[PDB]
Design a protein around this motif. Sequence first.
Motif, PDB file in Angstrom:
ATOM      1  N   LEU A 121       7.327  -4.278  -6.830  1.00 33.40           N
ATOM      2  CA  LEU A 121       5.960  -4.062  -6.369  1.00 33.40           C
ATOM      3  C   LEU A 121       4.988  -4.980  -7.084  1.00 33.40           C
ATOM      4  O   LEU A 121       4.092  -5.558  -6.471  1.00 33.40           O
ATOM      5  CB  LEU A 121       5.565  -2.604  -6.553  1.00 33.40           C
ATOM      6  CG  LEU A 121       4.119  -2.303  -6.129  1.00 33.40           C
ATOM      7  CD1 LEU A 121       3.891  -2.598  -4.628  1.00 33.40           C
ATOM      8  CD2 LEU A 121       3.757  -0.861  -6.382  1.00 33.40           C
ATOM      9  N   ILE A 174      -6.753  -4.101  -3.275  1.00 36.18           N
ATOM     10  CA  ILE A 174      -5.874  -3.021  -2.840  1.00 36.18           C
ATOM     11  C   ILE A 174      -6.237  -1.729  -3.561  1.00 36.18           C
ATOM     12  O   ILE A 174      -6.375  -0.639  -2.942  1.00 36.18           O
ATOM     13  CB  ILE A 174      -4.423  -3.379  -3.159  1.00 36.18           C
ATOM     14  CG1 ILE A 174      -4.050  -4.700  -2.443  1.00 36.18           C
ATOM     15  CG2 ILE A 174      -3.476  -2.244  -2.734  1.00 36.18           C
ATOM     16  CD1 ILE A 174      -2.798  -5.348  -3.001  1.00 36.18           C
ATOM     17  N   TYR A 175      -6.372  -1.846  -4.879  1.00 32.41           N
ATOM     18  CA  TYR A 175      -6.451  -0.642  -5.707  1.00 32.41           C
ATOM     19  C   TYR A 175      -7.843  -0.227  -6.179  1.00 32.41           C
ATOM     20  O   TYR A 175      -7.988   0.929  -6.579  1.00 32.41           O
ATOM     21  CB  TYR A 175      -5.502  -0.734  -6.913  1.00 32.41           C
ATOM     22  CG  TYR A 175      -4.015  -0.896  -6.493  1.00 32.41           C
ATOM     23  CD1 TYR A 175      -3.362  -2.130  -6.643  1.00 32.41           C
ATOM     24  CD2 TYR A 175      -3.316   0.175  -5.924  1.00 32.41           C
ATOM     25  CE1 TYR A 175      -1.997  -2.300  -6.222  1.00 32.41           C
ATOM     26  CE2 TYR A 175      -1.950   0.027  -5.526  1.00 32.41           C
ATOM     27  CZ  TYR A 175      -1.332  -1.199  -5.678  1.00 32.41           C
ATOM     28  OH  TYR A 175       0.001  -1.319  -5.322  1.00 32.41           O
ATOM     29  N   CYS A 209       0.824  -1.189   0.000  1.00 34.16           N
ATOM     30  CA  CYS A 209       0.000   0.000   0.000  1.00 34.16           C
ATOM     31  C   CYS A 209       0.878   1.267   0.000  1.00 34.16           C
ATOM     32  O   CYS A 209       0.493   2.302  -0.542  1.00 34.16           O
ATOM     33  CB  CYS A 209      -0.908   0.068   1.226  1.00 34.16           C
ATOM     34  SG  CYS A 209      -2.208  -1.181   1.151  1.00 34.16           S
ATOM     35  N   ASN A 210       1.999   1.212   0.712  1.00 31.06           N
ATOM     36  CA  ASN A 210       2.912   2.372   0.759  1.00 31.06           C
ATOM     37  C   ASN A 210       3.811   2.423  -0.471  1.00 31.06           C
ATOM     38  O   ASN A 210       4.598   3.375  -0.645  1.00 31.06           O
ATOM     39  CB  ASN A 210       3.837   2.201   1.948  1.00 31.06           C
ATOM     40  CG  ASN A 210       3.177   2.451   3.310  1.00 31.06           C
ATOM     41  OD1 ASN A 210       2.013   2.824   3.428  1.00 31.06           O
ATOM     42  ND2 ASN A 210       3.980   2.271   4.356  1.00 31.06           N
ATOM     43  N   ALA A 211       3.771   1.371  -1.287  1.00 31.90           N
ATOM     44  CA  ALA A 211       4.769   1.200  -2.379  1.00 31.90           C
ATOM     45  C   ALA A 211       6.206   1.267  -1.880  1.00 31.90           C
ATOM     46  O   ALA A 211       7.099   1.880  -2.503  1.00 31.90           O
ATOM     47  CB  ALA A 211       4.538   2.215  -3.563  1.00 31.90           C
ATOM     48  N   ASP A 212       6.465   0.600  -0.754  1.00 33.21           N
ATOM     49  CA  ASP A 212       7.782   0.609  -0.130  1.00 33.21           C
ATOM     50  C   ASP A 212       8.679  -0.436  -0.772  1.00 33.21           C
ATOM     51  O   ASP A 212       9.176  -1.414  -0.134  1.00 33.21           O
ATOM     52  CB  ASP A 212       7.660   0.362   1.393  1.00 33.21           C
ATOM     53  CG  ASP A 212       7.235   1.604   2.163  1.00 33.21           C
ATOM     54  OD1 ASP A 212       6.746   1.408   3.310  1.00 33.21           O
ATOM     55  OD2 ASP A 212       7.310   2.776   1.719  1.00 33.21           O
ATOM     56  N   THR A 213       8.896  -0.269  -2.075  1.00 38.42           N
ATOM     57  CA  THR A 213       9.736  -1.219  -2.821  1.00 38.42           C
ATOM     58  C   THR A 213      10.859  -0.526  -3.566  1.00 38.42           C
ATOM     59  O   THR A 213      10.834   0.687  -3.715  1.00 38.42           O
ATOM     60  CB  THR A 213       8.896  -1.978  -3.882  1.00 38.42           C
ATOM     61  OG1 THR A 213       8.312  -0.997  -4.757  1.00 38.42           O
ATOM     62  CG2 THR A 213       7.692  -2.744  -3.248  1.00 38.42           C
ATOM     63  N   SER A 214      11.831  -1.314  -4.021  1.00 27.77           N
ATOM     64  CA  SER A 214      12.975  -0.765  -4.767  1.00 27.77           C
ATOM     65  C   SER A 214      12.674  -0.430  -6.220  1.00 27.77           C
ATOM     66  O   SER A 214      13.407   0.355  -6.845  1.00 27.77           O
ATOM     67  CB  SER A 214      14.197  -1.694  -4.709  1.00 27.77           C
ATOM     68  OG  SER A 214      13.875  -3.052  -5.013  1.00 27.77           O
ATOM     69  N   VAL A 241       2.599  -7.764  -5.297  1.00 25.37           N
ATOM     70  CA  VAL A 241       1.139  -7.824  -5.473  1.00 25.37           C
ATOM     71  C   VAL A 241       0.739  -9.202  -6.015  1.00 25.37           C
ATOM     72  O   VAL A 241      -0.238  -9.802  -5.557  1.00 25.37           O
ATOM     73  CB  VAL A 241       0.687  -6.697  -6.413  1.00 25.37           C
ATOM     74  CG1 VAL A 241      -0.783  -6.851  -6.784  1.00 25.37           C
ATOM     75  CG2 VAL A 241       0.932  -5.374  -5.735  1.00 25.37           C
TER      76      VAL A 241
END
Lengths: 134, 80
Positions: free
Chosen positions: B28, B48-49, B18-23, B32
Amino acid sequence: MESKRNKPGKATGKGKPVGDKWLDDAGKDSGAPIPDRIADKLRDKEFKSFDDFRKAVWEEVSKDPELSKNLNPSAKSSVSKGYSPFTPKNQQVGGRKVYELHHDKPISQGGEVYDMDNIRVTTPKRHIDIHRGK
Amino acid sequence: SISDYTEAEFLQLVTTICNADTSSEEELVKLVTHFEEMTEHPSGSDLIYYPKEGDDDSPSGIVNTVKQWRAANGKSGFKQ
């Protein structure tokens, strides 16, 4: 051949006025145009590759209150990082789950790489339906 | 499978997404996809979206929707 999309270039073009349902349009017809206000931010800027330009498009979407208006907060987190947002499940194809930027006139047939008037935003499904009819 | 995660571990995964806390966007999308495979929910990433009107689309909201759906459908729950 050397790939033009992997070489730097300069964004040009005008885009078109769009509304609230802009991304809904991406699953219809020839997809959605680049929004005029995004073209206005990116025009004349140099990008390292088409993928760099693509990240800039989504970054600009994140910064425009009207164009990001009907993204949900999780979608907003994604576009704020320059990621393309997820489409609805029914518009995904396999591992292709996000909106795609495609060239309307193919680069191989004289279409320009960074010409925002030659770029369309499609869902994976709509892109694939268009491609299979060629 | 989802039953290899505790509810806490699953809440961390959903929060990452949800935060898009990816590299990268690729990372991401992989996350998902893994989330969809764990939940088995027919709505996939729409949980989620593109949440149904009235669903709580916060990370703990999504965890609870998954938990309740799996319970209603006779599926396994979280570890612990």
